[PDB]
Scaffold this active site. Structure first.
Site, mmCIF file in Angstrom:
data_model
loop_
_atom_site.group_PDB
_atom_site.id
_atom_site.type_symbol
_atom_site.label_atom_id
_atom_site.label_comp_id
_atom_site.label_asym_id
_atom_site.label_seq_id
_atom_site.Cartn_x
_atom_site.Cartn_y
_atom_site.Cartn_z
ATOM 1 N N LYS C 11 4.113 -6.179 12.131
ATOM 2 C CA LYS C 11 3.908 -7.502 11.550
ATOM 3 C C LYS C 11 4.362 -8.711 12.363
ATOM 4 O O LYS C 11 5.124 -8.583 13.321
ATOM 5 C CB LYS C 11 4.531 -7.516 10.149
ATOM 6 C CG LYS C 11 3.875 -6.496 9.212
ATOM 7 C CD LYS C 11 4.501 -6.483 7.821
ATOM 8 C CE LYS C 11 3.755 -5.521 6.895
ATOM 9 N NZ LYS C 11 4.324 -5.496 5.512
ATOM 10 N N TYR C 51 -5.283 -5.524 2.109
ATOM 11 C CA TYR C 51 -4.434 -5.550 0.920
ATOM 12 C C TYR C 51 -5.217 -5.733 -0.384
ATOM 13 O O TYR C 51 -4.687 -6.263 -1.362
ATOM 14 C CB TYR C 51 -3.401 -6.674 1.047
ATOM 15 C CG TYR C 51 -2.315 -6.420 2.074
ATOM 16 C CD1 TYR C 51 -1.530 -5.270 2.015
ATOM 17 C CD2 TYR C 51 -2.037 -7.356 3.071
ATOM 18 C CE1 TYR C 51 -0.488 -5.060 2.916
ATOM 19 C CE2 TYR C 51 -0.995 -7.156 3.979
ATOM 20 C CZ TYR C 51 -0.225 -6.008 3.892
ATOM 21 O OH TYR C 51 0.824 -5.813 4.762
ATOM 22 N N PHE C 59 2.477 -11.690 -5.544
ATOM 23 C CA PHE C 59 2.766 -11.918 -4.133
ATOM 24 C C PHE C 59 1.567 -11.910 -3.181
ATOM 25 O O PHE C 59 1.747 -12.046 -1.972
ATOM 26 C CB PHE C 59 3.787 -10.880 -3.658
ATOM 27 C CG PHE C 59 3.322 -9.453 -3.814
ATOM 28 C CD1 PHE C 59 2.313 -8.940 -3.004
ATOM 29 C CD2 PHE C 59 3.887 -8.627 -4.782
ATOM 30 C CE1 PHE C 59 1.871 -7.627 -3.151
ATOM 31 C CE2 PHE C 59 3.453 -7.310 -4.939
ATOM 32 C CZ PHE C 59 2.442 -6.810 -4.121
ATOM 33 N N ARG C 87 6.439 6.770 6.864
ATOM 34 C CA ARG C 87 6.960 6.016 5.723
ATOM 35 C C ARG C 87 8.475 6.206 5.641
ATOM 36 O O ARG C 87 9.213 5.278 5.301
ATOM 37 C CB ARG C 87 6.327 6.491 4.408
ATOM 38 C CG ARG C 87 4.838 6.219 4.284
ATOM 39 C CD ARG C 87 4.344 6.547 2.876
ATOM 40 N NE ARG C 87 4.754 5.537 1.902
ATOM 41 C CZ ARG C 87 4.722 5.711 0.584
ATOM 42 N NH1 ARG C 87 4.303 6.860 0.073
ATOM 43 N NH2 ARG C 87 5.099 4.731 -0.226
ATOM 44 N N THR C 93 10.875 -0.767 1.188
ATOM 45 C CA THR C 93 10.001 -1.935 1.298
ATOM 46 C C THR C 93 10.759 -3.234 1.572
ATOM 47 O O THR C 93 10.344 -4.030 2.416
ATOM 48 C CB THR C 93 9.159 -2.111 0.020
ATOM 49 O OG1 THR C 93 8.360 -0.940 -0.188
ATOM 50 C CG2 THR C 93 8.241 -3.317 0.151
ATOM 51 N N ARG C 104 13.144 -0.654 9.056
ATOM 52 C CA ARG C 104 13.459 -1.828 8.255
ATOM 53 C C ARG C 104 14.961 -1.982 8.078
ATOM 54 O O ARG C 104 15.480 -3.099 8.068
ATOM 55 C CB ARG C 104 12.761 -1.745 6.898
ATOM 56 C CG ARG C 104 11.260 -1.926 7.016
ATOM 57 C CD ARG C 104 10.538 -1.540 5.746
ATOM 58 N NE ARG C 104 9.097 -1.743 5.867
ATOM 59 C CZ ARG C 104 8.193 -1.164 5.084
ATOM 60 N NH1 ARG C 104 8.583 -0.338 4.120
ATOM 61 N NH2 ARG C 104 6.900 -1.413 5.257
ATOM 62 N N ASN C 117 9.028 -7.514 6.243
ATOM 63 C CA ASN C 117 9.629 -6.207 6.453
ATOM 64 C C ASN C 117 9.240 -5.443 7.713
ATOM 65 O O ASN C 117 9.082 -4.222 7.681
ATOM 66 C CB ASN C 117 9.414 -5.327 5.216
ATOM 67 C CG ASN C 117 7.955 -5.140 4.880
ATOM 68 O OD1 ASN C 117 7.074 -5.572 5.623
ATOM 69 N ND2 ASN C 117 7.687 -4.484 3.756
ATOM 70 N N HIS C 120 4.066 -2.275 8.629
ATOM 71 C CA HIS C 120 3.278 -1.773 7.519
ATOM 72 C C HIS C 120 3.056 -0.313 7.893
ATOM 73 O O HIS C 120 2.910 0.004 9.075
ATOM 74 C CB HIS C 120 1.902 -2.434 7.438
ATOM 75 C CG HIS C 120 0.911 -1.642 6.636
ATOM 76 N ND1 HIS C 120 0.829 -1.719 5.262
ATOM 77 C CD2 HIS C 120 0.012 -0.700 7.012
ATOM 78 C CE1 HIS C 120 -0.074 -0.859 4.825
ATOM 79 N NE2 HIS C 120 -0.585 -0.226 5.868
ATOM 80 N N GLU C 131 -7.626 2.347 5.965
ATOM 81 C CA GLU C 131 -7.040 1.337 6.838
ATOM 82 C C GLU C 131 -7.430 1.516 8.305
ATOM 83 O O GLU C 131 -7.732 0.542 8.993
ATOM 84 C CB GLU C 131 -5.515 1.345 6.675
ATOM 85 C CG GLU C 131 -5.071 0.838 5.307
ATOM 86 C CD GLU C 131 -3.600 1.078 5.023
ATOM 87 O OE1 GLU C 131 -2.874 1.513 5.943
ATOM 88 O OE2 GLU C 131 -3.175 0.828 3.874
HETATM 89 N N1 LIG Z 1 7.493 -6.512 -4.752
HETATM 90 C C1 LIG Z 1 6.932 -7.005 -3.651
HETATM 91 N N2 LIG Z 1 7.117 -8.287 -3.309
HETATM 92 C C2 LIG Z 1 6.564 -8.788 -2.218
HETATM 93 N N3 LIG Z 1 5.810 -8.051 -1.422
HETATM 94 C C3 LIG Z 1 5.581 -6.761 -1.700
HETATM 95 C C4 LIG Z 1 6.144 -6.200 -2.838
HETATM 96 N N4 LIG Z 1 5.762 -4.927 -2.885
HETATM 97 C C5 LIG Z 1 4.990 -4.694 -1.826
HETATM 98 N N5 LIG Z 1 4.876 -5.805 -1.102
HETATM 99 C C6 LIG Z 1 4.087 -5.962 0.142
HETATM 100 O O1 LIG Z 1 3.013 -5.004 0.107
HETATM 101 C C7 LIG Z 1 3.320 -3.964 1.052
HETATM 102 C C8 LIG Z 1 2.881 -2.583 0.561
HETATM 103 O O2 LIG Z 1 3.493 -2.276 -0.694
HETATM 104 P P1 LIG Z 1 3.273 -0.829 -1.367
HETATM 105 O O3 LIG Z 1 1.877 -0.921 -2.166
HETATM 106 O O4 LIG Z 1 4.417 -0.692 -2.493
HETATM 107 O O5 LIG Z 1 3.302 0.274 -0.381
HETATM 108 C C9 LIG Z 1 4.834 -4.044 1.240
HETATM 109 O O6 LIG Z 1 5.188 -3.449 2.491
HETATM 110 C C10 LIG Z 1 4.939 -5.563 1.349
HETATM 111 O O7 LIG Z 1 4.301 -6.000 2.552
#
Ligand SMILES: Nc1ncnc2c1ncn2[C@@H]1O[C@H](COP(=O)(O)O)[C@@H](O)[C@H]1O
Ligand SMILES: Nc1ncnc2c1ncn2[C@@H]1O[C@H](COP(=O)(O)O)[C@@H](O)[C@H]1O
Ligand SMILES: Nc1ncnc2c1ncn2[C@@H]1O[C@H](COP(=O)(O)O)[C@@H](O)[C@H]1O
Ligand SMILES: Nc1ncnc2c1ncn2[C@@H]1O[C@H](COP(=O)(O)O)[C@@H](O)[C@H]1O
Ligand SMILES: Nc1ncnc2c1ncn2[C@@H]1O[C@H](COP(=O)(O)O)[C@@H](O)[C@H]1O
Ligand SMILES: Nc1ncnc2c1ncn2[C@@H]1O[C@H](COP(=O)(O)O)[C@@H](O)[C@H]1O
Ligand SMILES: [Cl-]
Ligand SMILES: [Cl-]
Ligand SMILES: [Cl-]
Ligand SMILES: [Cl-]
Ligand SMILES: [Cl-]
Ligand SMILES: [Cl-]
Lengths: 154, 154, 154, 154, 154, 154
Positions: C11, C51, C59, C87, C93, C104, C117, C120, C131
């Protein structure tokens, strides 16, 4: 062949300071192969044979005291022009004069009655052959493949 | 005394990949002392003695093939609760499950017919004593001071 | 086969801070293979596709602003159970919750309107396939040998 | 302006050995900015264009075989006097002659039919402009801020 | 604000072992900002004030002997949830129990009459405020920009 | 005696970039002892006293602006021939000319109105004595044992 074997001694100052791994890694990262290695505590007679060329020099005894102060790690490195390459990697005899980037340049400085300089490296192919035989028996040296050996097949 | 000795074998995968130095450094940085060490090429007989407890397990043959594939570095580490501490530093048996920060977690992943996992670490004081005696003669193990030993004088 | 491919995006925060190399090295050291990689500057359209599952989450907008702030490095890693392994290496996260030793955990902490963070990592094989196809054309992904591949021949 | 752009190729030997990250980190730590980068598998015709100046030299074919052996990472570095600086960082053409501290000095040594030397670095501004155009389209090069850019504002 | 300041003391064992830089780097790499720092030699009076809460505990005297053994480096770190984050980075109080990856887990193990554990980290915001005021005068704490601060502008 | 003390200033560019720890580690690893250290924000008058020898040079004001841009870390290093050794470790004044392996060679390149070069190192014993007195009071300098000091006892 351009492939040679040279002897390196990780001296007491390096062992005491916990620099064994960092020194070995520099050789591995360069591409040199460790074909023999062991921790031993050199006796005075063996030390004097190793440094026989300096027996009449003023710093001789201090050198023997230094190299036999604690155990050391003796190892044989194999690779293209290994003797001159390892000498270059070691740097100047007196660490204060050694260039940053070299083993002595990065790790050495302080001295005792002897010029503590982290490691020993054979100065020539002739010396290397003699020194290797002093510390290693043929059964302690090995021929095996390092990961990238296949890449350099000519 | 809380001080103990444990046996570590830097396996063929680590030797081939040029990770000997990096592994040794982790132990030195932790404060553990290398009291014995040597590169050897284990034959099947010695390997089966080391892994005698798995003589009847399924993965036995592949394990022997793996540990005797290339030379390895056997070493004895001494320190406060060294046995459990080194096992903790090693990480999970299968590197894919090992936590980042551990030796297996940072360096291991790929496997052959055997679960290649970078190093071996004695699983107990009893195993350590047996393993150390199997690979080392008493005269190959040393008692000497590491730089900061004096600091911990009780 | 246990071998799989996963997508990692280094990132904007990591690129700006000059951490590209350190991140890549952690994957290389683990034994993972880089089969594809390129620096690109993601526009909003591409970012929203990547995304798409968070299109309705709170967010979302801030996340798109963040991932398109500066160029990023997209790369495909191949290896045994690569998806879950990467992962695991990434850590929690939110970097403040990430364990020391993880990417991280060691490199991240500060946040903007988005939870910056560092990287990705695909959350599953299904997501990885989607992806990878989004950022790479088949001809940009390669099959080649890393140095130690031969060691693991089953 | 003193700011220049130069082309670096992380050669097959470096890719195979898993040194991509370590090499990139040296450039990032120096303060150089990566404005373009991608992993590609160079074809013979492209390789011959890159090394067109050596087409009549004895080592030409071996050089083409070497640079196209596996994928490589091509990248464009931007910074104050980048061309001469990166050349200095690379070190002597033959790694055995390269000074410790340089990329070739620390990582290279072994050779195949070709003098494997870890990376390629443009030798002049003229060569850099030509080489960058051979591997990159304008849309693949970016202008963005690295963390400390503001500090050097004159 | 989520941003807070915490106090870290690089203890005598870390200073004597030459680990000041490595410890500081872990905090810098995490993104934490050093807003105050100095090498001092704590006398018993100052030490007892710092550890006043343990005045009646068994390990008190040995703890005072330990923290005043040699000079230490006291420093104030500022960042998002810095107090708990630094405690997390530090690891378990007794280094033998600390996880690999943490400061104590990677650097500590041996103990004297006191449980030598490399660094001290404030256990709460309340303790941090008290400890910072004990070792630093307001004029020794600074507000300045770290390279990437601008990236996180909310 | 060969033991000397020299002054090092980790300049604003290094502080801003988060290189304090990495710089300090190079000195610790060399064997140099930190006998004094603190983060301060140099005022213009103090900066002009430090650089009084260049008061009439064209780059003077830019140098004052640079050294007082953000806080810095001033420290006193003690060791065998410390003045010349630290100067060697620092490298050429202009980082672009500094050899890889040196502090400026590895970390510096970009410049502002001033030739930003990571650190300052006393140029002579005379300058060192004067510079140390400018930034440190006797009560801020210490005499204590580093781990390996006993090894060098003559
Ligand atoms: N609670 C959150 N607040 C802000 N960004 C988030 C949050 N959860 C996920 N993200 C963003 O979305 C990415 C993927 O989330 P995930 O779907 O939980 O694997 C995270 O690495 C962040 O870049
Ligand atoms: N003045 C000295 N004091 C202590 N040891 C020395 C001294 N000179 C040489 N040596 C030792 O002898 C080795 C070879 O020196 P030279 O053959 O002159 O390159 C040095 O690397 C040291 O191991
Ligand atoms: N389930 C397994 N499959 C393959 N190899 C194993 C397995 N368990 C243990 N090993 C091998 O035996 C070693 C010691 O296992 P342990 O007796 O559980 O400490 C492991 O480090 C591997 O080298
Ligand atoms: N003898 C050689 N064998 C293999 N490659 C070479 C050789 N000489 C030069 N090269 C390649 O050509 C590049 C430039 O060499 P030069 O222009 O002489 O500095 C070297 O960095 C290698 O990539
Ligand atoms: N059980 C203990 N034995 C010896 N020292 C301790 C013990 N617990 C705490 N300490 C010392 O006091 C410090 C702070 O402890 P704590 O109040 O639990 O955060 C620890 O980092 C040690 O320096
Ligand atoms: N041209 C310059 N621009 C900015 N700073 C300089 C310049 N020349 C010298 N300096 C500063 O003065 C120091 C000593 O320079 P010199 O005495 O010539 O070795 C350098 O390390 C810088 O800190
Ligand atoms: Cl030298
Ligand atoms: Cl684990
Ligand atoms: Cl985590
Ligand atoms: Cl060179
Ligand atoms: Cl822990
Ligand atoms: Cl230089």
């Amino acid at each position: 062949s351009e492939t040679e074997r040279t002897l390196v001694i990780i001296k007491p100052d390096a062992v005491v300071r916990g620099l064994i791994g960092e020194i070995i890694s520099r050789f591995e990262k360069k591409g040199l192969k460790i074909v023999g290695m062991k921790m031993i505590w050199i006796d005075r007679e063996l030390a004097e044979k190793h440094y026989e060329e300096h027996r009449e020099k003023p710093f001789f005894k201090a050198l023997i005291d230094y190299i036999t102060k604690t155990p050391v790690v003796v190892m044989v490195l194999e690779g293209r022009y290994a003797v001159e390459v390892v000498r270059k990697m070691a740097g100047a005899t007196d660490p204060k004069d050694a260039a940053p980037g070299t083993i002595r340049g990065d790790f050495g400085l302080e001295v005792s009655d002897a010029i503590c300089n982290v490691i020993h490296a054979s100065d020539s192919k002739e010396s290397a052959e003699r020194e290797i035989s002093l510390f290693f028996k043929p059964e302690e040296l090995f021929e095996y493949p390092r990961a990238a050996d296949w890449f350099y097949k000519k």
